[PDB]
Amino acid sequence: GLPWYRVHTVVINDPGRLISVHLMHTALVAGWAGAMTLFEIAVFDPSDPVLNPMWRQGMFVLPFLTRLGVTQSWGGWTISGETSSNPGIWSYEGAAASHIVLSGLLFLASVWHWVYWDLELFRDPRTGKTALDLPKIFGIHLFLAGLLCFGFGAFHVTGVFGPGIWVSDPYGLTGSVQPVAPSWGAEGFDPYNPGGVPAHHIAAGILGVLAGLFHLCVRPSIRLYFGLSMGSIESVLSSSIAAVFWAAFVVAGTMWYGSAATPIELFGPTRYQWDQGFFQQEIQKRVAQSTSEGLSVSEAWAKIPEKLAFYDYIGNNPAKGGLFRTGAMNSGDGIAVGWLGHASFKDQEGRELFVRRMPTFFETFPVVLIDKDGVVRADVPFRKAESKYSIEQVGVSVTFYGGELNGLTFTDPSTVKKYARKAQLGEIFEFDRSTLQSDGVFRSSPRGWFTFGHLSFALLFFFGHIWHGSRTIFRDVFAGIDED
Template sequence: GGWSITGGTVTNPGIWSYEGVAGAHIGFSGLCFLAAIWHWVYWDLEIFCDERTGKPSLDLPKIFGIHLFLSGVACFGFGAFHVTGLYGPGIWVSDPYGLTGKVQPVNPAWGVEGFDPFVPGGIASHHIAAGTLGILAGLFHLSVRPPQRLYKGLRMGNIETVLSSSIAAVFFAAFVVAGTMWYGSATTPVELFGPTRYQWDQGYFQQEIYRRVSAGLAENQSLSEAWSKIPEKLAFYDYIGNNPAKGGLFRAGSMDNGDGIAVGWLGHPIFRDKEGRELFVRRMPTFFETFPVVLVDGDGIVRADVPF
């Protein structure tokens, strides 16, 4: 059988399933590798030769303009068509607790809210704006020659200078991607990439679980009924094995048949001492590798423990 990332009824999504998107990116990166190898081998093509002298010659400012224009078109197209759903599926959008996520079109957010990393509309508006700027800048570099002093001063004819400076110019994007993955954003939904370590540290999902249980008890539900209404996804997010800072901990056995990986929720145990106080398990801090079982009451007083 198949599986659904939302836990709902499985339907055939076609090629653009969760794995299909990942596979397409892997395949495209492989094609980029092959293109790089091809250009490495066939570096002395006629197109790279000066017609007047017959010697190899690269017009690097023009090459820069071509690549900037093409990357601008791709950037604009992604924001204006793919993300907005104008010609494409949209992107994954979910609620703050990662329970209702699905692929849907997104309208660009042109106000200050577009700078909020958790607002999906900012993804569309950013790519439209950045793509437009890239297209205009690319056309400018294709049609305008740099002054000779600037050309020589910035060593624009030197391939090493051009390549190294271009790496530096876009290197910030790697920091943005790493930062959004670590701290969380609209580009890294919980359903697709899992919780962040800060959601574990702050008991983010635990607080929502207890809020729902308390609301259920206020409606005269039994403790068992209130807990049974907690979505499995919400309970699963509040599992220390899903904390990305835990690395390879909480994994045991062979990965190929799922041993050591949580596949279901058996329920929530409730501990009480002989006075009838409900006890809660102290959360393991992120950067501890081992931690005793410490049971505290509602006032934070330690009532029992199971040492190492």
């Protein structure tokens, strides 16, 4: 009999039952999408577009709804901080309910295809047996995919009929959904350019339409049909799985490294932005400008937006969480309340020392106050006996500008040490940890969870493609050898 891992092999030869189980899986996926969206709207707190955005709340499909245009909600609010006067029918809950009713209709269609499986459409009239013209089915599917891709690229993202996509400034401060003009030049192949998406989708849709028309028109050859077994369903299964984990690897890399399709204000910042000093660079540039024309360091730090200083915090690092540190970042290190201001450290003779920011690989880092010249001047010494760079010996005082603490100078070592420890993580923020009872360890971004899950699934589907391709080529010897 069929083993437990071979049960679905009952529907290899049945196209009607195959369509039924495809519809059942598709209904399950649509129902999950709707249920996940309702769950995330139920547990979603829109009470801070800036300091507690969706990626700080561990929202998974909320950025994907947001990226393609769904920004308003039936709850009477907008994620950008505005008020939804009339969100219409296409809100978050609207899309979820549409997915739920789609799942129900697909479940009914799956039941119908399970019952009425014996359709002569699945039987070729030349011999009466049940067979599928897989090259022609592929041509139809490729033609349909070309039309859908070209329509999505020429009507939705371009805004001539649709709403466009999520476009923002390079540092992810404002963010919105705009129609985007296609970039047909080499800059269209710029990954962070939003204009590549409409141009790519238009060109790929047109070429897919042409390839589908060609596949509808022209039959395969003897050599190709007997080599790749185009009359077999495991062959197309193997190759489809190959394309699927190819796309999974590509999109996992895109999510991890960042692109125009992965906005930072939706999926969190990237680890390379923290590693390469992106937000710290922009903050210090926006300080150097407007300190070069008056309004000195005592002021003008308020000209630094709180969102940028939040982006300059390693707690928003996607590669700083854990495998089993479950939940949102808010459940990890509290909810951000406000910016405490930039901490400037000075010794007794007046040199400006700065903390050595902890890298991504380290979870516990030694605190070192190092000067402009790059010479280690102070630290929180582990020894504290025959120690040469301790806080009270160097005489380090910490000051704050532009935050809740402004013009406040702290001199005592017990307070200077803890503010230096807070500054070791980047910009210093205060966190309410009593609302969700946070444990104190950093969590992972939705971007990080997406990339981890998709890479694991990509390797698993590499194995699946190997197994199915082996079964494809070696179908006749699957029960043993010929012994002759």
